[PDB]
Design a protein around this ligand. Sequence first.
Ligand code: FES
Ligand code: FES
Ligand code: FES
Ligand SMILES: [Fe+3]
Ligand SMILES: [Fe+3]
Ligand SMILES: [Fe+3]
Lengths: 427, 427, 427
Amino acid sequence: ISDARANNAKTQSQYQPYKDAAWGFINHWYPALFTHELEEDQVQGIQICGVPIVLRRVNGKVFALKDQCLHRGVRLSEKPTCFTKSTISCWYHGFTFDLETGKLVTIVANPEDKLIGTTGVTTYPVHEVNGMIFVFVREDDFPDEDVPPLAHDLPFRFPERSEQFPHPLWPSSPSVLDDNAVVHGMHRTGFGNWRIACENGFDNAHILVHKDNTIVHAMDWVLPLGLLPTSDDCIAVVEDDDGPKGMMQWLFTDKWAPVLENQELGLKVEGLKGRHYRTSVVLPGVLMVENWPEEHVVQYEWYVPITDDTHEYWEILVRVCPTDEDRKKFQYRYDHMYKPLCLHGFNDSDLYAREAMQNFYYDGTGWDDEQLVATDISPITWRKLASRWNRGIAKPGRGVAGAVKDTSLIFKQTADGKRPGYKVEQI
Amino acid sequence: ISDARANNAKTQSQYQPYKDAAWGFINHWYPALFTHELEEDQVQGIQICGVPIVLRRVNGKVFALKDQCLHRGVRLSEKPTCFTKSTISCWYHGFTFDLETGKLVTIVANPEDKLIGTTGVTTYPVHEVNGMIFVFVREDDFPDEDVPPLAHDLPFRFPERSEQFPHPLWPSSPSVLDDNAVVHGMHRTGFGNWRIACENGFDNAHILVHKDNTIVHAMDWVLPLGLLPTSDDCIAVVEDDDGPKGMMQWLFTDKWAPVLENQELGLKVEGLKGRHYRTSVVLPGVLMVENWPEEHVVQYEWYVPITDDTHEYWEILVRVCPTDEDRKKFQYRYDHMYKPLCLHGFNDSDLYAREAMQNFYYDGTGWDDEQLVATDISPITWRKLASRWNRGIAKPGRGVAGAVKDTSLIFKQTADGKRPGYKVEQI
Amino acid sequence: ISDARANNAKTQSQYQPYKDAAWGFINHWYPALFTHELEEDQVQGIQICGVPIVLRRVNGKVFALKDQCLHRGVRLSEKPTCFTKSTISCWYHGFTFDLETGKLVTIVANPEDKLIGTTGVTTYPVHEVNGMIFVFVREDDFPDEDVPPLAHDLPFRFPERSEQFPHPLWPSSPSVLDDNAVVHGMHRTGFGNWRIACENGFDNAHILVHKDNTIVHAMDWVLPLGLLPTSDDCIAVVEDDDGPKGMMQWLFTDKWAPVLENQELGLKVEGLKGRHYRTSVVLPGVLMVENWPEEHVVQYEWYVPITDDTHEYWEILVRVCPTDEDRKKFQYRYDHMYKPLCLHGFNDSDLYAREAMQNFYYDGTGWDDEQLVATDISPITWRKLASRWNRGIAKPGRGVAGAVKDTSLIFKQTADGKRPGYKVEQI
Ligand code: FES
Ligand code: FES
Ligand code: FES
Ligand SMILES: [Fe+3]
Ligand SMILES: [Fe+3]
Ligand SMILES: [Fe+3]
């Protein structure tokens, strides 16, 4: 371990909370499911920050409660059982909860029990917009009054912030919150801790991972070895009360210079063909790549913690489509261009790169022994702001799936060929 | 956690031993194998309460010894090797043991070693009757003269106890011990702790789990939401020296009233069609369902601890068949009725309901945080009597299969598609 | 536990370091790959003694470095990336290391970083000879000038030591170091600790394991029950400075007598049909079986530790083949004789016998509770010499594959059907 590494003792002491958040930052908004994954009267169970959550759509509205019956702890989502439009019941002994408040309103075959009405399950705020269902995953005692607006946990919006973050080389990126904004993408389980997966996206030295991607050569791009920071303010940290807490990297300005050569090895690039884009990241860990893969289109990624060693990776492309025809154009270009070359292919390289780094950090070794360099100003800056502004550190799961990693149940599922997952299997 | 729950501090303190028995209650009789699973000269390895056991039938008689060579700990049952009618040898280095006493009588290629005769492996009493081989799984130092009769660990017998447990609505249920009693059924490995699997069988509020079973609607039954206790003595606890230690639930009497409605949800049943039956459980955890699925037939269930998170679930139907004709009719009805609709179908629902609850309890959370209600007088009563009358608490396995849950051998087997099991695979 | 067992307290205290070496003996030579497994410009990752290692052949020469980028710990071997003949780069962020010294010579897209040249990854000495690539797996601080010659970690050589270890009944066994010595064989991952796999090879009481092997009855052999030591010097321990550290068993002399009968079981052999051979073992745990399976042919086995519960089992046959014709005869006899009847068949029996013993020892139980006998003078003598002459005890892996056994990555791979392994999968 060299003394020339950027993550020295003082620097590391600045992001201890981050090192302690293996299970994720709780009391934040996270994408839960795509609208198409939850139809009218459909019930679905998931897990975020170690918290089991069940969702149901009733009369067009989505509700979210803890997927844990308070009687004997089974998941309510394994066998969806709802007798009324305003409740969800446990299929085992009939404990029935109010969708709106989560209160135990009754017990199917024991309507007069003294336990009724004296307790209930945790509820989770839901915000569905333009094809996506977001859920505010919170601790049991986080007050309703303190729940912030979804926007506070989403990337910086444009043109709203075009003056704060000038972007003369490309038109404004749309937000999932914008009217007529259309979302195309997917989410799948990533194997490894969410933090390590999150840090890859805005790292300007990992470009090497994409050197051989097909889209790179199909688009005749002659990529740069990487990007180097040239000044101390190459990244802007934003932490105002009203708004997202995160950072913006001044890519395509002189604060970040592209590298073309290496005299040792003897490498040197002389074809400056490429794309104009910009990355930023905000709590709870949302990446935004402006002007990617093309103008008017933007890519967003989430690394939702499920347990301390799995996460649900989201990858979407957004574009505002005012007319029925605009939607068809975007759907078409996604289907025959974006999805096969960008989401699959370009990003697949990121997928395995993240996994390859997990072993170094899981038992704690990497958080101490990693030897960061100049380009690592990016993850380091992120860790510090995340440590300062997170709304809570999730506690390890207890008495839920994922609390114990080597149960006979898990070996059974594994024997049957099932990998660690996210969506609860039913029946 | 509501103060209105039945399992308060005082109640919980009354079943600490039960909370401590994850590996099972040792020094008890357990069904090991069906007679048809062990033919003349056949050797089979199994595991109960964490204890590896090997059985062999010689001249019609079954013997059981610890499936662990005292030399270097391999399982004797993996490659059956017996040179004489009175012994079983280890296929590795030849240590040979007397089937009757378990003494080390010799070593194939080292007949004069001084270790010979100075030690041996543990023996386990066997009791085979009407198609079933029972084994008294005991600690290494439990004395032979202290082994109790099998009947002490089997359900209450009728008509012997018909006066103690009146049953005017149905004929007496037969015992596996009765002459001409015929057994039909099966046992399979269940994933999760034995205690949680055991408590489901006699719970009168889980009826909801069967609301959709095919047999229920094929037999025009209009089930009750559940059953509620009406008096403090709705369950009779029996604990006399000579006899089984357990409890009898006074089903189909004043003490247990069927629930027909729930005003909150607006539910209400008006078709009282069903079956007459009665459940009781005795240590080590044997369920008896009288008059099920039909008169003169009785169902018995065991949840034999294998390790602390797997158990062997037994499900059998018994009926006395004095003549060859009676046996054919019972075999036929089992094959084309009981098996497909009852053992499979009705009980399969219980199988998955048990599993769904295991995660809440494995790490200990559920044993403290569960919020039991009125109908839970059943499991609570069982945990108390079990705590008071068990003949021992099995210690965790050491140096045996299951002692460690994440060995490379287990990952290899899992990769090959093999789930956690019970019967040792040979060769 | 009987007091008549050979491994009494005093004896056990003589091999504590061996009990402590679950991860293996480090600072020793080990077979890494067969020459055919690493062609010109090919890169391959492996793991020995918990240490991740990557090899590459350049201009005919093989180099080995630690398969762990010092930046953020990914394995360099997962996506082979080399820009020059004298280096190997990390495919993630471009850290580049010198093959010869392991020094960090540059960073592709950050050639001026202050970290460059101030550190590097560990290098491992390589000795390739007659088809086998050996690697000196050492601790990070083991001096280059202290690396001993490969021969010190290889079995005793003949005729060099024919006078020291007289063998009138068979011609001298060739060494992998001999000119024109040809190697044929294979290595595969073994499931369980290396020590338990290693001790089986030179045990003279496990002969029973091969009683049914096809080659035994195809060769009309009437095997002995086993062999017993007759004198205290039945094993010669060698520990001179210049040379291998190990032991030679005086098989086929009166110090080891074959057993023909067992009066207790009534067994007795009358047909002394067999083969002449002799076993010896040297650190780090290499077996040599002289005159096996035929004259002029010798079998060597390694049990290379990968982690503390997996090892790479090597099984090779060596014969000196001066002419092109001699090589074809050996290749032929291996292909249609040795491989099918000896490597597979005879040795497959040893493979499963080793596995069956692993559970007793992994949690520590067996290392204390095993009850060894007279024939165990063999493993006991080996444990003592190993404890005394090992060049170091490998420390548990940290921040590398194998450091944590139940990661979601391991469950993913297992779910996909992949067993624990050795060679790193690429892409
Ligand atoms: S576990 Fe849900 S009602 Fe009993
Ligand atoms: S392990 Fe059984 S005789 Fe050696
Ligand atoms: S992990 Fe290897 S260069 Fe970053
Ligand atoms: Fe990338
Ligand atoms: Fe049931
Ligand atoms: Fe052998």
